[PDB]
């Protein structure tokens, strides 16, 4: 299947550092679940394009992707009566993700209520930012979310693997240039300090 | 898309440590190529099952899998006039892989010559162990190789990522305490040189 990949190199901007988040899975609390996920939020610098990736921590192959561009954003702006520009939208989204971290908000992943007569749609989920209230819970933003197809998933997990390997290389080489200190400084310490243990005996004969 | 996955837990045995290998891609040297690959060789302990995985170093999503079980092994034994048991076969394959490492042998990945009128097959390649000779090159073993389907590739790359994460956590957690330890223990100079620099002067002053 087809899905937007954020393969834009240096133009990819992390709008928020990747974090672990407790996410709600679906509507009815008797049939729902709360799972530990990993959220990745990034945009493109040269064009209006935002992608939010949600992975289940236990199996990052379980990926849910939300991609909103200019047109999509216009549809969202109309449907949800948003009073912001694309940049202000990004600001709001970031802010709300941080609120979901602090617990001020809750991130939900709701199955879209589908049936045979409503035709067919690409997005089978909604990524919702919900405020728990004592009168009625309030949904601040509802984004069309998709179950990532294998090609895209494989792209992100492969990329993550490569990044992990590069990081391991940087770590082990940052250890390697430092690993000379552990073989030089203790060899300068435990073997050459004996000239001090024997110097006191030299001082002993001329101590009076 | 189906392919055998070595998801047999502790029963999975590395018959050979994962290594980098230069592999030949296809027959006619005017249309062939030589690429750096990573070879993974593993078997199951409780049943006769061998899998060789070949990934292109530059992109491990490019995966070629050879899976041999009992029946398959009987077919190879007949067709190639092999005079060994399954265990002895595993021994020979390991030996030959080591020889490919040393340069005594060459590992080829040859496209099977297909056309519309021939019987359709799942395996579109041959993993061949070729001995370069001055009379005529000799092919010691020819295994039916398959181009790994997405599901399987995603399984192995995801697995590799998880293992990589475990390795990173173990590495940096074992590294940080020594990065502080070298900063506490390097002072051993300034800690013992007061006992050294003033005692050299005491010894200079007593026999002055």
Residue numbers in the entry:
A (entry chain A), B (entry chain B): 9 to 216
Provide text from the study:
Centrioles are complex microtubule (MT) based structures that are required for the formation of centrosomes and cilia/flagella. The protein kinase recruits STIL/Ana2/SAS-5 and Sas-6 to a single site on the side of the mother centriole where they assemble with CPAP/Sas-4 into a cartwheel structure that helps to establish the ninefold symmetry of the centriole. Here we show that Ana2/STIL proteins also homo-oligomerise and that mutations that perturb the homo-oligomerisation of fly Ana2 in vitro also strongly perturb centriole assembly in vivo. Thus, Sas-6 homo-oligomerisation alone appears unable to drive efficient cartwheel assembly in vivo if Ana2 is unable to homo-oligomerise.
In initial attempts to purify Sas-61–241 the protein invariably formed large aggregates (blue trace) that appeared to be elongated chains of protein by negative-stain EM. It has previously been shown that a large hydrophobic residue in the headgroup is essential for the N–N interaction in several species, so we mutated the equivalent residue, F143, to Asp. Purified Sas-61–241-F143D behaved as a dimer by SEC-MALS (red trace) and aggregates were no longer detectable by negative-stain EM; we conclude that aggregate formation is dependent upon the N–N interaction, and the F143D mutation perturbs this interaction in vitro. To investigate how Drosophila Sas-6 might oligomerise into a cartwheel we solved the crystal structure of Sas-61–216-F143D to 2.9 Å. The asymmetric unit contained a dimer of Sas-6, associated via the coiled-coil interface. The DmSas-6 N-CC dimer could be superimposed with Sas-6 N-CC dimers from D. rerio, Chlamydomonas and Leishmania Sas-6 (average pairwise RMSD 1.87 ± 0.31 Å over 617 ± 47 backbone atom pairs). However it could not be superimposed onto C. elegans SAS-6, which has an alternative head-group-spoke conformation. Furthermore, we found that the DmSas-6 N-CC dimer could be modelled into a flat ninefold ring, similar to that observed in crystallo for Leishmania Sas-6. We also examined the structure of Drosophila Sas-6 and confirmed that, similar to other Sas-6 orthologues, it associates via two self-interaction interfaces, a C-terminal coiled-coil dimerization (C–C), and an N-terminal headgroup oligomerization (N–N). The interface between the headgroup and the C–C was similar to that seen in most other species, and different to that observed in C. elegans strongly suggesting that Drosophila Sas-6 assembles into a canonical, flat ring structure. In agreement with previous studies, we found that mutations that perturb the ability of Drosophila Sas-6 to homo-oligomerise through the N–N interface in vitro (GFP-Sas-6-F143D) cannot support efficient centriole duplication in vivo, and this is also true for mutations that perturb the ability of Ana2 to tetramerise in vitro (Ana2-CCA-GFP).
